[PDB]
Design a protein around this nucleic acid. Structure first.
Ligand SMILES: Nc1ncnc2c1ncn2[C@H]1C[C@H](O)[C@@H](COP(=O)(O)OP(=O)(O)OP(=O)(O)O)O1
Ligand code: SF4
Ligand SMILES: [Mg+2]
Length: 1114
DNA sequence: TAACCGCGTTC
DNA sequence: TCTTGAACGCGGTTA
């Protein structure tokens, strides 16, 4: 069957890898001991593992499944070895009495696929008394191949759906072996992952291939060096349109190999014989490119395909090559009669992405999207290169590439080549070390470590831990389709997340005095807690003792001066310090403090201080209908013929689509009757957390957090090295910076995976699901951060607060940073505002019930006090600009701008210029104003220097843009906007992006709006009027097209049949665009100035009504 | 006015 | 088949 067509395919693959140099090496036979202390005398071959692929092999009739491992040896060659391992899953029963009887049933019903049967015990944390050593008995169903495992799984799931569904009734006045199968387990594990876990094999490690298995060579830890190749293509699309594979040609293909770069050209579209040249933006990224000037598109592709075979790459890297680059090559190779699989070994898979067997295809766009921590507006290759590579790649309009093929091709080749050097060094500096080091710990291959969701990565890490501790894997979670509460059907239940608040707004600077009204009782507490808060810092936060200090009383008196000095002067006016307090890896440390894991959340029925009762906050959004109502609409629905995708009944439907209809018909009934559709209620629930459960989950979080803490630490050490270096030595400074951009990206690359251990608990299909633990983690974080704000509020003023961070000001007379001294010829760091917080969270949040198993054989536990929740401080900063809302008594959260002592921009957040695709004028306005919030010498002087830039930008919108040129206009007025889906999935929804897409469709043709993610760049129109903005967006692209279609389309949407004008200035509603500018100046300039006591610096933007009335009263 | 949506941020 | 979470700003429609 498919074993036959699956064993044919391997032949093909087996021959491809041999063509690309991957011999199938079988180790010599060895009748000796499986020694580990010396692997040198055991005969075999050493290799650095570089890929894995599940395959189907034959002896030495149906296939026996296994994994092909691709190696790079130390002699400079390569080989390939295979392991065989029986796929398997388990069966669980109700009655341990009858365990041997159902095994008899399994052997006979699964006769055609079962290979072996076994009775296995595993620890199951679902089970009473499992912490005393009790285990659960399972039946292990091994198989030959994975095609037979699937057959058996399709033979039992019928039984599983009888043992629950019904129960036939016969003799009403009155046990089968089939009803003992409670469930199957570990049935949905992918085969290649099952092998790497059970055999403890990872890509990026060194193994000595031997007859009895792979032996990890603990000696060599450093990676080997593959042969890397990155490439980017250039095409010849039509003007105004994205390239199509059918017609469009292929001008060039640039690529790089192991540090030497190459370029091949198509002379039927080009026009010159480009000569060998150099392009290195920085001396660290060489780019000497030798060009292969070829004639036709076939000579192109045939030289590319032959060069790959001549270099044997183990990794091909691209940039959005799975959605464009590769897929075009295949369609233009088929168009010219070639087989990519037969020539290179690449082909698309079930997900549409391109892969091979010997060569991992690394699409850099997936590391940038997932691990770069860059905003979506910075995920193009240019923004990525400036951010991560430290130079500017050459930009070129897409609508000038194919003309400049004939026009000026020696610059076109520089674009071609710049995209390659960007892609090659981006991969070599960021993608290669991150992904391959991630394969060291995560049991997948490079092209899957690169593409899986971060939640799935966490699932993989937790499975290795569950397997090595002999823990039975829970099945994948399935959400209940119907859930109720007090008689109402619910729309969405959730917990309340973190705590966000904006408190003050405006400008604050390290040289402009501020007013601090201080609570004396607050300092009185700081007075009492002071002796123990310093004993805190030296012990908990530095791992030392006050016995070794030389100056504890010397500094304790030193800082009690500055606090008692303030005890008298409650009201002061001094320069402020701008500081930031944020706890390091909050939610992970909240979890590892409270021993929080999903299996630790028990009930009353799952059970002297082991149970730790913690509180979370449930939030439900339910309909305002009762079940009498709910019952009434189901009867109406039952008398309706529904389509089949000829017409079926309501009960013949799928239950999932039943609720869908019910919800859509309860959608409108509940509204017209019960006045609304969503009613919100939040109840604070309590849950217990066993402090003695198998800590396999929380130990995976602690292990991964510790793995990130080192990178986050090394970055700080190199930050100080950059401080203590002369402001000139080029190499030095550069080197530092280079290292601090790598170690910040790396620690941030671990940041999302680390925090995905908390999100995994709520993920759809999670094996370890529990709404309780995610809610407990958030409310603990909320209560911690609100306790911290209540303290700083009484001694300074916090400006903004989010989840675990607090921006604040404190008077300059407040104690800042001191350093303890030891008799070791060393010193210890202390910043009092951090420690005063950390002492008091270590007094109201430590876990005095943390129990750990300290002798397993006798099942003894021991209690201690664990808490790893520390604040960290960054600063002091020079300035911070916080906007304010256009409504009364309301700031705005999640956006501000801070500035380093240097004047450099430290952090800018939330605003429109960072966001992907807003309107460029607002983006250009914002990238102009925050900089001149640093000029001037008084506050009201600041707001007027910034007002100059505000009025100059208003002059552009007030003068109808007649100062900007007819080409520098269209970009400053553009509004580029992405559409997550395709048009027909938006029917019923009317936005500006919607109509721009439909208008761009019947102009350029339906080929423009085929795939999703399309960029709706448009302008708002003046005509028609007395109408919505929704029905007024004009696709900006028409203005470069042909005049009659210009007038035809524009006249249709303007409702004016006369072609009065064709200029952008004619149709654009300037009153709209100046109102969107007026809102920006209100939020960032004037309203902030008012609340700081400065009259309107830009009186051309008018204060809102409520603030005028508030000004008149004062 | 206020609820509610899509998008893309900040956590 | 594959799949981290919630809170929020802002423009825009809808009730
Ligand atoms: N992608 C995310 N997914 C889930 N939770 C997140 C995410 N980002 C931030 N958070 C949640 C969990 C965080 O611990 C918590 C605080 O975020 P944040 O302070 O920015 O980083 P962090 O506290 O986890 O590490 P650190 O502060 O050292 O950079 O909010
Ligand atoms: S809290 Fe105590 S009684 Fe309850 S399950 Fe855990 S160990 Fe058993
Ligand atoms: Mg934090």
């Amino acid at each position: 069957a498919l074993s036959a067509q699956q064993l044919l395919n391997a032949s093909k693959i087996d021959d491809i890898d041999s063509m690309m140099g991957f011999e199938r090496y079988v180790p010599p036979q060895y009748n000796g001991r499986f020694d580990a202390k010396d692997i040198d005398q055991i005969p075999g071959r050493v290799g650095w593992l570089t890929n894995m692929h599940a395959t189907l092999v034959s002896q030495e009739n149906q296939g026996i499944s296994g994994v092909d491992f691709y190696f790079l040896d130390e002699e400079g060659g390569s080989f390939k070895s295979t392991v065989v391992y029986d796929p398997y899953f388990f069966i669980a029963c109700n009655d341990e009495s009858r365990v041997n009887d159902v095994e008899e049933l399994v052997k006979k019903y699964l006769e055609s696929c079962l290979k072996s049967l076994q009775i296995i015990r595993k620890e199951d944390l679902t089970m009473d008394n499992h912490l005393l050593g009790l285990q659960k008995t399972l039946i292990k169903l091994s198989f030959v191949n994975s095609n037979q495992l699937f057959e058996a799984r399709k033979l039992l799931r019928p039984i599983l759906q009888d043992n629950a569904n019904n129960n036939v009734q016969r003799n009403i006045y009155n046990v089968d072996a089939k009803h003992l199968i409670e469930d199957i387990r570990e049935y949905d594990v992918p085969y290649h992952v099952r092998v790497s876990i059970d055999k403890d094999i990872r890509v990026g490690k060194w193994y000595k291939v031997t007859q009895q298995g792979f032996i990890e060579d603990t000696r060599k830890i450093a990676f080997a060096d593959p042969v890397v190749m990155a490439f980017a293509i250039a095409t010849t699309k039509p003007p105004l349109k994205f390239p199509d594979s059918a017609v469009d040609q292929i001008m060039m293909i640039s690529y790089m190999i192991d540090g030497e770069g190459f370029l091949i050209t198509n002379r039927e579209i080009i026009s010159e014989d480009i000569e060998d040249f150099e392009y290195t933006p920085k001396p660290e990224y060489p780019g000497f490119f030798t060009i292969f000037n070829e004639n036709d598109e076939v000579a192109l592709l045939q030289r590319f395909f032959e060069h790959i075979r001549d270099v044997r790459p183990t990794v091909i890297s691209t940039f959005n090559g799975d959605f464009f680059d590769w897929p075009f090559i295949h369609n233009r190779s088929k168009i010219h009669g070639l087989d990519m699989f037969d020539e290179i070994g690449f082909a698309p898979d079930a997900e549409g992405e391109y892969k091979s067997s010997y060569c991992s295809h690394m699409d850099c766009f997936r590391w940038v999207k997932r691990d770069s921590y860059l905003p979506q507006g910075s995920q193009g290759l240019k923004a990525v290169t400036q951010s991560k590579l430290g130079y500017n790649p050459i930009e070129l309009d897409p609508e000038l590439m194919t003309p400049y093929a004939f026009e000026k091709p020696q610059h076109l080749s520089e674009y071609s080549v710049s995209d390659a050097v960007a892609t090659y060094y981006l991969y070599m500096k960021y993608v290669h070390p991150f992904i391959f080091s991630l394969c060291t710990i995560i049991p997948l291959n490079p092209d899957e470590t690169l593409r899986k969701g971060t939640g799935t990565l966490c699932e993989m890490l937790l499975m290795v831990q569950a397997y090595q501790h002999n823990i039975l894997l829970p099945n994948k979670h399935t959400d209940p389709i119907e859930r109720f509460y007090d008689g109402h059907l619910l729309e969405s239940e959730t917990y309340v997340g973190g705590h966000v608040e904006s408190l003050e707004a405006g400008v604050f600077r390290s040289d402009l005095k501020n007013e601090f009204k201080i609570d004396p009782s607050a300092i009185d507490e700081l007075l009492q807690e002071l002796p123990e808060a310093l004993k805190f810092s030296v012990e908990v936060e530095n791992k030392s003792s006050v016995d070794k200090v030389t100056n504890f009383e010397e500094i304790k008196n030193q800082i009690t001066q500055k606090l008692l000095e303030l005890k008298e002067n409650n009201i002061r006016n001094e320069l402020p310090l701008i500081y930031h307090v944020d706890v390091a890896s909050m939610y992970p440390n909240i979890m590892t403090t409270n021993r929080l894991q999903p299996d630790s959340i028990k009930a009353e029925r799952d059970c002297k201080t082991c149970a730790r009762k913690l509180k979370w906050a449930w939030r439900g959004e339910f309909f305002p209908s009762k079940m009498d109502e709910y019952n009434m609409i189901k009867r109406a629905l039952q008398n309706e013929t529904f389509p089949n995708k000829k017409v079926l009944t309501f009960d013949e439907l799928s239950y999932a689509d039943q609720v869908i209809h019910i919800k859509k018909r309860l959608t409108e009934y509940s509204r017209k009757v019960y006045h609304r559709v969503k009613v919100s209620e939040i109840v604070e629930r309590e849950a217990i957390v066993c402090q003695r459960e198998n800590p396999f989950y929380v130990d995976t979080v602690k292990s991964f957090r510790d793995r990130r803490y080192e990178f986050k630490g090394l970055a700080k050490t190199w930050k100080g090295n950059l401080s203590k270096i002369d402001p000139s030595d080029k190499h030095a400074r550069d080197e530092a910076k280079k290292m601090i951009v790598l170690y910040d990206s790396l620690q941030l690359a671990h940041k999302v995976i680390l925090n995905s251990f908390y999100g995994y608990v709520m993920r759809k299909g999670s094996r370890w699901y529990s709404m309780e633990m995610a809610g407990i983690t958030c409310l603990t974080g909320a209560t911690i951060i609100q306790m911290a704000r209540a303290l700083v509020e009484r001694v300074g003023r916090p400006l903004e607060l989010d989840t675990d961070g607090i921006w604040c000001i404190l008077p300059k007379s407040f104690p800042e940073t001191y350093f303890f001294t030891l008799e070791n010829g060393k010193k210890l760091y202390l910043s009092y505002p951090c420690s005063m917080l950390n002492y008091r969270v270590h007094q109201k949040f430590t876990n005095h019930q943390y129990q750990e198993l300290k002798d397993p054989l006798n099942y003894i536990y021991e209690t201690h006090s664990e808490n790893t929740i520390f604040f960290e401080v960054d600063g002091p900063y020079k300035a911070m600009i916080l906007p304010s809302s256009k409504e009364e008594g309301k700031g705005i959260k999640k956006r501000y701008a801070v500035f380093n002592e240097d004047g450099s921009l430290a952090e800018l957040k939330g605003f429109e210029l960072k966001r992907r695709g807003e309107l460029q004028l607002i983006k250009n306005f914002q990238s102009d104003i925050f900089k001149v919030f640093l000029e001037g010498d008084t506050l009201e002087g600041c707001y007027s220097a910034v007002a100059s830039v505000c009025n100059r930008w208003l002059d552009v919108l007030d003068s109808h843009g007649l100062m900007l040129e007819d080409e520098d206009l269209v970009s400053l007025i553009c509004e580029n906007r992405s559409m997550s889906k395709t048009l027909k999935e938006y029917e019923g929804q009317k936005s500006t992006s919607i109509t721009t897409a439909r208008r761009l469709g019947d102009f350029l043709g339906e080929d423009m709006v085929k795939d999703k993610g399309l960029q709706c760049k448009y302008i708002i129109s003046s005509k028609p009027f007395n109408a919505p903005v929704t029905e007024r967006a004009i696709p900006v692209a028409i203005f470069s097209a042909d005049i009659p279609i210009k007038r035809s389309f524009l006249r249709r949407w303007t409702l004016d049949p006369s072609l009065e004008d064709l200029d952008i200035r004619t149709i654009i509603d300037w009153g709209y665009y100046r109102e969107r500018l007026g809102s920006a100046i209100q939020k960032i300039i004037t309203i902030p100035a008012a609340l700081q006591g400065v009259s309107n610096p830009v009186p051309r933007v008018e204060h809102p009504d409520w603030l005028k009335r508030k000004i008149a009263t004062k």
